[PDB]
Design a protein around this ligand. Structure first.
Ligand SMILES: O=c1ccn([C@@H]2O[C@H](COP(=O)(O)O)[C@@H](O)[C@H]2O)c(=O)[nH]1
Ligand SMILES: [Mn+2]
Ligand SMILES: [Zn+2]
Length: 390
């Protein structure tokens, strides 16, 4: 189908202006050790990062102690029979409240998310998966975007472990879109490594500790679609349904070899990661701060050198910033607006009129089509400031 952009229905309009450092959406702060007060402030300019807001839970992450039974070798609890229950779909404030209530009675929960980045500028969280020892929940993060902040009561309670596999981006996506933070994280990815298993992916873990062959076919899927296809629903459910058992086995092995503290330390840092707009990204890019990364050709003249002539660097760069503003304007992803191959094609063939732009051998996107004149004008200008100068 056409899949009506779900953003259009958000209670708060998206902003790609990037006119200010990223601000946490967190209006409340449970399981607090340091009042939300201090949190919302700033960290005025320095040589390692311009003004920015800090991670609203950085403190508690460092200062709050872990759940006792995490340091003990406990008997592993098998995942529950896939067929004994159906995944609970959550898309109402009521459906959401009963789950929260239910989540508060746990010692630990497994969590995962599905994200979309083709019809959005920064990207958006379309689905969230949460598993307890008894059931699997499927949360529509699109429809409950403005409500999911109440989950903090559980996600920040150090007395409930939260299991994620390689949550380095989940932590980011969670704050950026839902204002959710995580205190008491256990990353099965960092655990796999410490133990030294042949591979460290979730797929690997599922096949060897839960006999479940996974599918990469849904990491290109459009998680915006409603309802979700059975095969899609199953894949999402499979991401947290077996994680708590896998968690038990890894935690125990980590304990048995004196490597837990190391894994917990690694997890605390993944949880501490902060989301900041590219504009205000730290000078020295690291794993403590995450700034939007471009999924395509080098910033200017692409390295993919489709045999990109000398002078055409300016043309190329004008096309880039143009595509970015357009993407930021209609809140789309750069490749949707115009994929590099096309950017290249334009630069490579330098069409000077609308015909030339829309009949461009490779093919054309809607944005390129709906802006063919501006693009022909821009291209024609390049070809001219090239003939002039020298
Ligand atoms: O090769 C990949 C793997 C994952 N993802 C993104 O990560 C989300 C969660 O993937 P995972 O952490 O469950 O593997 C996906 O829904 C998708 O947005 C990708 O874009 N490409
Ligand atoms: Mn994931
Ligand atoms: Zn997943």
């Amino acid at each position: 189908g056409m899949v009506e952009k779900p953003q259009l229905k958000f209670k708060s309009p998206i902003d790609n202006s990037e006119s200010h450092p990223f601000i946490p959406l967190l209006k409340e702060k449970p399981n607090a050790l340091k009042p939300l007060s201090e949190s919302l402030r700033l960290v005025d300019d320095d040589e390692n990062n311009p003004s920015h807001y800090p991670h609203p839970y950085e403190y508690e992450i460092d200062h709050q102690e872990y759940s006792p039974e995490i340091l003990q070798i406990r008997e592993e609890i098998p995942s529950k029979s896939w067929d004994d229950s159906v995944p609970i779909w959550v898309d109402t404030s009521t459906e959401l409240e009963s789950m929260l209530e239910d989540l508060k009675n746990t010692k630990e929960i497994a969590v995962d998310l599905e994200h979309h980045d083709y019809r959005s500028y920064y990207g958006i969280v379309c689905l969230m998966q949460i598993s307890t020892r008894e059931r699997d929940y499927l949360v529509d993060t699109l429809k409950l975007r403005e409500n999911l902040h109440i989950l903090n009561e559980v996600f920040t309670n150090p007395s409930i472990v939260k299991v994620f596999h390689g949550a380095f981006m989940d932590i980011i996506w969670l704050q950026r879109d839902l204002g959710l933070y995580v205190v008491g994280l256990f990353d099965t990815y960092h655990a796999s490594k410490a133990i030294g298993l042949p591979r460290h992916s979730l797929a690997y873990l599922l096949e060897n500790f839960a006999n479940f062959k996974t599918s990469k076919k849904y990491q290109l899927a459009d998680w915006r679609i409603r309802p979700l296809s059975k095969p899609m629903t199953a894949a999402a459910r499979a991401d947290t349904h077996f994680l708590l058992n896998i968690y038990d086995q890894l935690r125990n092995k980590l304990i048995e070899s004196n490597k837990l503290a190391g894994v917990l330390y690694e997890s605390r840092n993944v949880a501490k990661r902060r989301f900041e707009y590219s504009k205000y990204r730290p000078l020295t890019p690291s794993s403590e701060v995450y700034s939007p990364i471009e999924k395509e050709s080098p910033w200017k003249i692409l390295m993919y050198q489709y045999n990109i002539p000398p002078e055409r660097e300016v043309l190329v760069r004008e096309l880039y910033q143009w595509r970015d503003l357009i993407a930021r304007r209609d809140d789309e992803s750069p490749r949707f607006v115009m994929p590099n191959q096309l950017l290249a094609a334009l630069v490579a063939y330098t069409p000077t009129d609308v015909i030339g732009v829309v009949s461009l051998t490779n093919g054309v996107t809607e944005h390129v089509r709906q802006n063919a004149k501006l693009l022909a004008n821009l291209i024609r200008d390049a070809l001219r400031n090239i003939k002039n100068t020298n």
